Amino acid sequence: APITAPDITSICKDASSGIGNQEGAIRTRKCCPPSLGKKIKDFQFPNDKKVRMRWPAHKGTKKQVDDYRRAIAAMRALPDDDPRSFVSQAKIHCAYCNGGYTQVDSGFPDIDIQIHNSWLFFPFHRWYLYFYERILGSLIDEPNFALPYWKWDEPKGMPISNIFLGDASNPLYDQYRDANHIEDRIVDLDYDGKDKDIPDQQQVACNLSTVYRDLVRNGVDPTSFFGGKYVAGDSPVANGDPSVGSVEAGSHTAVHRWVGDPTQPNNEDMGNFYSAGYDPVFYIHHANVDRMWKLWKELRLPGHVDITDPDWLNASYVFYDENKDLVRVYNKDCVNLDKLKYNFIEN
Amino acid sequence: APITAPDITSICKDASSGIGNQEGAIRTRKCCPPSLGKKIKDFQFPNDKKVRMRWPAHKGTKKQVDDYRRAIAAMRALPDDDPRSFVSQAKIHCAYCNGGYTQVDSGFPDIDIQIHNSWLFFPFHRWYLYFYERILGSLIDEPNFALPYWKWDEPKGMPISNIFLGDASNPLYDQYRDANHIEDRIVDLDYDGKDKDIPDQQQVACNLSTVYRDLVRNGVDPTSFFGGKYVAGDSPVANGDPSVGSVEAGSHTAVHRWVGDPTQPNNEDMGNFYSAGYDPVFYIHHANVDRMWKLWKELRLPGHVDITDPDWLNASYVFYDENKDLVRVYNKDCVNLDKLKYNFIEN
Amino acid sequence: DGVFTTPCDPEY
Amino acid sequence: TPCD
Ligand SMILES: Oc1cccc(O)c1
Ligand SMILES: Oc1cccc(O)c1
Ligand SMILES: Oc1cccc(O)c1
Ligand SMILES: Oc1cccc(O)c1
Ligand SMILES: Oc1cccc(O)c1
Ligand SMILES: [Cu+2]
Ligand SMILES: [Cu+2]
């Protein structure tokens, strides 16, 4: 039976798993979404007249960068208890990744829902971003709004984009980042918690190698790429478990560890799930992870196929949308980007 | 219909194509092979007990280096008219690359055979080296003899190996090299006839980017990697033609231009097909070009597959082997390195 | 990996 | 753009 989110606005508990230092935690663990007594409605495919074209974060136009900053600022300006707010959007990640919900709707109220470290990883984050992007557009009255994506698979895209830097006056800034790494600028997709101290050009080569390993060498079939089968009745898979998919365990994890500030108790913000969403770059990194799924499929290789297991197809999550409606979405319905009315500008 | 070498001992003319300055040419254009009363026999797969392991030129054991040096010396000690001799082996390149032979056996007696600048590039040179290597081993009675290869895809291997340097007392030496470049040591795989005034570590990065360009970015399918289709009735494809494959037009060409001596009439030795084989490093560079073919398939990327067109499979050449027998070989028979009983020592 | 030899090795 |  498929993993099924309950009414997250009626059945939710404080996040208390996967956070090593709760005593000194700098972000809240009260990550439950606002309870507005709304009815959960089924997803309907968008009727957008144009496709939203996500743009490389290092090659944005003035309007792209300006619109994005304005949208994030608007989001930061909302009171937290607005489900579209900066903090509410961050808490979504906390609730789904750090044990806010249980499998009660599947008859297992004794077991948490975890969307990480399994085949739920890609589709959950695809939906998370889908609503996030549409919410941002609505806040600035831009019906064709699109997120940037951090193109760390291309050399010019490997340095963290300057648009995220500066100080608090920049809405895309977050003080809780590894200061030494931000100075280095170039992300280490092979980062394992220890600085390599290698030449920049060698880091580029290392990063190109890492993307190849995650998309081709190790992502050879649906189980190795998406991650292990995870269904109702299953306990949460531990971080670093061998069954975790190639991208999630590889380049994905590396970027989070690299950006997260090691002087913080849980390496907040990016260094832990529960706090990652408080860094705007979280969503932009994840937009490229979302793109990795597209690239993996476009590689017409044996085994590079989508999942057909019903217990994956029928897994579902709940999100607030731009109208503050509650929407249930299914994995099966996000596999086709044309139907979600967005794509990525390549090069 | 496939390109088919004639009886090369019966139908052959002096090289007169692709040599800009024939008047001042420092090597002979009389590149035809010796006639020993042999008849041409079909190839048979070797029954070697062990696989010969080619070694990176910058990391040879004392025995590997001493054996190679002894073998080349023995080849230089042979009179030129021996088909196994240093000069005979060099002339093979001249005859196949500078218009020694015609397509007479295909019914086109007024068109030359050219093995460069098409899909014949990789398999012709694989066979050329296969016999060259087995001849060398025979001259020193080492049944498991293997060539070195110039591993310029790895930083440590990018400097031309010191084994090729010194003076004429070293059999691996050739005076007709770009003296300034030999002093620089680090090959420029992007060399286009103008010295780059850049630091060594940047040249390393340039070289990495070039190997990535040739094997991944531009070698996207058999046509783009191996080069354009070339069959009986086709005229010779020009150097620099758009249809030339990625490795041949790229890193391959750069190394030849870089090592060739610009003070010579045709940039002899490496700077022109007709003279390149007079430099021992020619074969060792080409052994890594041979390895690029292996690497390209091992990448297991989409389109990285061998050619299946019969007009490629059934194309053939004629070489002398270590028994001074004439052997006809076909492209189809060199695609599997296990059956040719050699491979490469990898990291 | 890919076309690169141990590019992530800090001790190359 | 290491090849300049
Ligand atoms: O609403 C805003 C505008 C700019 C920066 C910021 O942190 C919030
Ligand atoms: O495109 C590239 C490939 C490898 C190293 C580098 O600095 C750039
Ligand atoms: O730039 C480098 C340095 C060391 C190994 C490598 O593959 C690339
Ligand atoms: O070679 C494979 C591996 C996995 C799924 C498939 O359809 C093909
Ligand atoms: O056999 C091939 C040749 C070219 C592209 C591809 O995906 C497969
Ligand atoms: Cu997540
Ligand atoms: Cu040649």
B300 in A contact zone (CB under 8 Å): yes
Cis amide prior to A269 (ω within 30 degrees): yes
* A285 labeled binding residue: no
Single out the catalytic residue among A58, A181, A286, A304. A286
State how far the Cα of B317 lies from the Cα of A261, in Å rounded to an integer: 63
Q: Quick one: which H or E segment has residue A75?
A: helix A62-77
- Cβ–Cβ gap C3/B295 under 8 Å: yes
Residue B163 CA, ligand 6 centroid: distance in Å: 54
State how far the Cα of B191 lies from the Cα of B257, in Å rounded to an integer: 7
Nearest to residue A9, comparing CAs of A91, A68, A78, A77?
Answer: A91
Residue A197 CA, ligand 2 centroid: distance in Å: 17
The DSSP symbol for B126 reads H
C10 in A contact zone (CB under 8 Å): yes
Q: What count of residues does chain A have?
A: 347
Cβ atoms A258, A181 nearer than 8 A:
yes
Per-residue CA distances from A18 to A96, A179, A190, A271 (Å): 11, 24, 22, 11
Backbone angles phi, psi at A137, to 5 degrees: -60, -40
Q: Kindly report the number of other CB atoms within 10 A of residue A197's CB atom.
A: 7
State how far the Cα of B282 lies from the Cα of B1, in Å rounded to an integer: 31
Per the entry, the structure determination technique was X-ray
Catalytic residues of B, by residue number, are: 93, 116, 125, 252, 256, 273, 286
SS3 string, B84-107, reads: CCHHHHHHHHHHHHCCCCEEHHHC
At a CB cut-off of 8 Å and minimum separation 6, what does A195 contact? A180
Edge-to-edge strand ranges of the sheet holding B40-42: B40-42, B326-330, B316-320
To what resolution in angstroms was this structure determined? 1.9
Q: Kindly report the number of other CB atoms within 10 A of residue B118's CB atom.
A: 26
State how far the Cα of B196 lies from the Cα of B182, in Å rounded to an integer: 15
Residue A198 CA, ligand 3 centroid: distance in Å: 9
Torsion of the alpha carbons at A212, A214, A216 and A222, rounded to the nearest 10: -160
State how far the Cα of A11 lies from the Cα of B323, in Å rounded to an integer: 84
State how far the Cα of A290 lies from the Cα of A122, in Å rounded to an integer: 7
CA A291 from centroid of its chain's CA atoms: 11
Q: Is C10 in the pocket of ligand 3 (CB under 6 A)?
A: no
At a CB cut-off of 8 Å and minimum separation 6, what does B305 contact? B222, B297
End-to-end CA distance of chain C: 14
The DSSP symbol for A252 reads I
State how far the Cα of A86 lies from the Cα of A75, in Å rounded to an integer: 5
Q: Which chain C residues are Cβ-neighbours of B216 within 8 angstroms? A: 2-3
Edge-to-edge strand ranges of the sheet holding B342-344: B148-149, B52-56, B342-344
Q: Where are the beta strands (DSSP E) in B60-155?
A: 102-103, 108-112, 148-149
Single-letter code of the amino acid located at B190 = D
State how far the Cα of A171 lies from the Cα of A70, in Å rounded to an integer: 8
- Cβ–Cβ gap C2/A213 under 8 Å: yes
Q: Quick one: which H or E segment has residue A55?
A: strand A52-56
Nearest to residue B192, comparing CAs of B249, B237, B270?
Answer: B249
- What would the two tokens of residue B197 be? 């005034």
Of the candidates A197, A202, A213, the beta carbon closest to that of C1 is on A213
DSSP string, A96-142: HHTT--EEGGGTEEEEE---SSSTTHHHHHHHHHHHHHHHHHHHTT-
- What would the two tokens of residue A54 be? 């996500």
Cβ atoms B25, B267 nearer than 8 A:
no
Question: Binding site for Cu cation: which residues of B?
Answer: 93, 116, 125, 252, 256, 286
At a CB cut-off of 8 Å and minimum separation 6, what does A269 contact? A27, A174, A176, A177, A260, A261, A275, A276, A277, A278, A279, A282
The residues pairing with B103 across neighbouring beta strands, listed in sequence order, are: B108
From B119, B216, B221, B300, give the residue whose CB has the most ligand 5 atoms within 8 Å, as the site to mutate.
Answer: B221
The DSSP symbol for A57 reads T
Cβ atoms A201, B210 nearer than 8 A:
no
State how far the Cα of A238 lies from the Cα of B302, in Å rounded to an integer: 33
Cβ atoms A81, A132 nearer than 8 A:
no
Nearest to residue A305, comparing CAs of A214, A221, A219?
Answer: A221
State how far the Cα of B45 lies from the Cα of B32, in Å rounded to an integer: 27
Cβ atoms A242, A11 nearer than 8 A:
no
Half-sphere exposure of A220 (CA within 13 A, CB side): 4
Nearest to residue B29, comparing CAs of B91, B88, B73?
Answer: B91
DSSP string, A172-230: T--S-S-HHHHHH-B--TT--SS-----HHHHHHHHHHHHHIIIIIS--SHHHHH----
Ligand 2, atom 1, lies closest to the CA of: B209
- Cβ–Cβ gap B205/D2 under 8 Å: yes
State how far the Cα of B101 lies from the Cα of A162, in Å rounded to an integer: 61
Ligand 2, atom 8, lies closest to the CA of: B209
Nearest to residue A92, comparing CAs of A326, A346, A344?
Answer: A326
How are beta strands A108-112 and A102-103 bridged, if at all?
A: antiparallel
Q: Where are the beta strands (DSSP E) in B123-240?
A: 148-149
Nearest to residue A29, comparing CAs of A275, A235, A237, A238?
Answer: A275
The highest-level CATH class for domain B1-347 is mainly alpha
At a CB cut-off of 8 Å and minimum separation 6, what does A107 contact? A1, A232
Catalytic residue status for A93 = yes
The DSSP symbol for B159 reads B
End-to-end CA distance of chain A: 41
Instruction: Please name which ligand lies nearest the alpha carbon of B219.
Output: 5
* A304 labeled binding residue: no
- What would the two tokens of residue B80 be? 């030129």
Nearest to residue B234, comparing CAs of B307, B334, B312, B308?
Answer: B312
Radius of gyration over every alpha carbon of chain A, rounded to an integer in angstroms: 19
At a CB cut-off of 8 Å and minimum separation 6, what does A146 contact? A52, A53, A54, A55, A64, A133, A342
State how far the Cα of B293 lies from the Cα of B121, in Å rounded to an integer: 11
Q: Where are the beta strands (DSSP E) in chain B?
A: 40-42, 52-56, 102-103, 108-112, 148-149, 316-320, 326-330, 342-344
- What would the two tokens of residue B28 be? 């002979």
Touching partners of B (3+ C-beta pairs < 8 Å): A, C, D
3-state DSSP assignment of residue B287 = helix
Nearest to residue A154, comparing CAs of A309, A308, A345?
Answer: A345
Residue B210 CA, ligand 2 centroid: distance in Å: 8
Radius of gyration over every alpha carbon of chain D, rounded to an integer in angstroms: 3
Backbone angles phi, psi at B40, to 5 degrees: -80, 120
- What would the two tokens of residue B302 be? 């989409």
Ligand 1, atom 7, lies closest to the CA of: A171
The C-alpha angle with vertex B251 and arms to B247 and B253, in degrees rounded to 5, equals: 90
Cβ atoms B278, B173 nearer than 8 A:
no
3-state DSSP assignment of residue A246 = helix
Q: Which chain A residues are Cβ-neighbours of C2 within 8 angstroms? A: 208-209, 212-213
Burial A79-111 (b: 16+ CB within 10 A, else e): eeebbbbbbbbbbbbbbbbbbbbbbbbbebeeb
At a CB cut-off of 8 Å and minimum separation 6, what does B145 contact? B52, B67, B71, B133, B134, B136, B137
The conformational region for residue A56 under phi > 0 = left, psi -120 to 50 = alpha, else beta, is beta
- What would the two tokens of residue B305 be? 């597959």
The DSSP symbol for B229 reads -
Domain ranges of chain A: 1-347
Nearest to residue D1, comparing CAs of A161, A251, B196, B151?
Answer: B196
The single residue listed with the structure tokens 């050879």 is A220
Cβ atoms B314, B331 nearer than 8 A:
yes
Q: Quick one: which H or E segment has residue B284?
A: helix B281-298
Single-letter code of the amino acid located at B315 = A
* A256 labeled binding residue: yes
The C-alpha angle with vertex A226 and arms to A117 and A341, in degrees rounded to 5, equals: 115
Sign of the alpha-carbon torsion through B314, B319, B321, B323? positive
Cβ atoms B154, A205 nearer than 8 A:
no
State how far the Cα of A148 lies from the Cα of A347, in Å rounded to an integer: 13
Residue A170 CA, ligand 1 centroid: distance in Å: 7
The DSSP symbol for B268 reads T
- Cβ–Cβ gap C7/A212 under 8 Å: no
Single-letter code of the amino acid located at B335 = V
Per-residue CA distances from B289 to A38, B56, B162, B252, B344 (Å): 66, 13, 20, 7, 12
- What would the two tokens of residue A276 be? 């990652």
Cβ atoms B256, B250 nearer than 8 A:
no
Cβ atoms B188, B258 nearer than 8 A:
yes
Q: Kindly report the number of other CB atoms within 10 A of residue A166's CB atom.
A: 10
The DSSP symbol for B178 reads -
Single-letter code of the amino acid located at B224 = S
Where does B150-241 have alpha helices with state H? 179-184, 200-212, 222-226
From A167, A169, A278, A279, give the residue whose CB has the most ligand 1 atoms within 8 Å, as the site to mutate.
Answer: A169
The single residue listed with the structure tokens 């000194």 is A24
Those of residues 193-252 in B touching chain C at CB distance below 8 A are: 208, 211-212, 215-216
Instruction: Please name which ligand lies nearest the alpha carbon of A172.
Output: 1
Per-residue CA distances from B118 to A284, B237, B288 (Å): 44, 7, 19
C8 in B contact zone (CB under 8 Å): no
Cβ atoms B311, B2 nearer than 8 A:
yes
Nearest to residue B135, comparing CAs of B126, B146, B124?
Answer: B146
- What would the two tokens of residue A165 be? 């830097």
Nearest to residue A123, comparing CAs of A6, A286, A9?
Answer: A286
Those of residues 198-217 in B touching chain A at CB distance below 8 A are: 201-202, 204-205, 208, 212
Single-letter code of the amino acid located at B91 = K
Single out the catalytic residue among A58, A93, A181, A304. A93
Torsion of the alpha carbons at B179, B184, B186 and B187, rounded to the nearest 10: -40
Half-sphere exposure of A270 (CA within 13 A, CB side): 27
3-state DSSP assignment of residue A340 = helix
Question: By CA distance, what is A198's nearest residue in B?
Answer: B201
Touching partners of D (3+ C-beta pairs < 8 Å): B
Q: Please report the number of interchain residue pairs, chain B to chain C, with beta-carbon separation below 8 angstroms.
A: 20
Cis amide prior to B221 (ω within 30 degrees): no
Nearest to residue A238, comparing CAs of A225, A222, A227?
Answer: A227
The single residue listed with the structure tokens 């600048």 is B117
State how far the Cα of A99 lies from the Cα of A102, in Å rounded to an integer: 7
Cβ atoms A314, A328 nearer than 8 A:
no
Helix axes A86-97, A121-139, angle to 10 degrees: 170
CA B305 from centroid of its chain's CA atoms: 21
3-state DSSP assignment of residue B342 = strand
- What would the two tokens of residue A178 be? 């590894």
The single residue listed with the structure tokens 């066979």 is B127
Backbone angles phi, psi at A319, to 5 degrees: -135, 150
The Cα diameter of chain D in Å comes to 6
State how far the Cα of A110 lies from the Cα of B293, in Å rounded to an integer: 56
